[PDB]
């Protein structure tokens, strides 16, 4: 019955980037499928990295390496920078 989607969080981001613009439901559907795709790619590669080393757990090292393998050179540097910033803020809270 009850569905589950990211439309709330996408709208929250949109109002931070452009507080004067709105988004149609058809565009929201594409934005919703985009996150599910990249999520599945990263989690897949992280699982393979863990299996090759014979480890039972997934950690931030697997996520960071998967990001460096999957994302292009300029996107990777920024994504890694803010991922480490977020983790540092969480652990220091």
């Amino acid at each position: 019955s009850r569905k589950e989607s990211y439309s709330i969080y996408v709208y929250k981001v949109l109002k931070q980037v452009h507080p004067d613009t709105g988004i149609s439901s058809k565009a929201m559907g594409i934005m919703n499928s985009f996150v599910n795709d990249i999520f599945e790619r990263i989690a897949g590669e992280a699982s393979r990295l863990a299996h090759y080393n014979k480890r039972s757990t997934i950690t931030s090292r697997e996520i960071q390496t998967a990001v460096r393998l999957l994302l292009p050179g300029e996107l990777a540097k920024h994504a890694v920078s803010e991922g480490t910033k977020a983790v540092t803020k969480y652990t220091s809270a």
Partner: protein, 78 residues
């Protein structure tokens, strides 16, 4: 024989979107065969997923999964 429903004007419109300026008279019958071959490979997979679930109605997700398996990810239909 419904392949004749893909008319010459529609093929020309598709060629125009692709930037083709001048079109030879034999392109139409070649294009019909290419499309006929493409559709069968997708429908066979969609029906396979429909049968595994024991359903009788082909569903949009069956087509989405059939296309993704071929490397043609489609965004917009959930």
């Amino acid at each position: 024989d419904n392949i004749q429903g893909i008319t010459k004007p529609a093929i020309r419109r598709l060629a125009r979107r692709g930037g083709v300026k001048r079109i030879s008279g034999l392109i139409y019958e070649e294009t019909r065969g290419v499309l006929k071959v493409f559709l069968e490979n997708v429908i066979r997979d969609a029906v396979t997923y429909t049968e595994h679930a024991k359903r009788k109605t082909v569903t949009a997700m069956d087509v989405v999964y059939a296309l993704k398996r071929q490397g043609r990810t489609l965004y917009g239909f959930g």
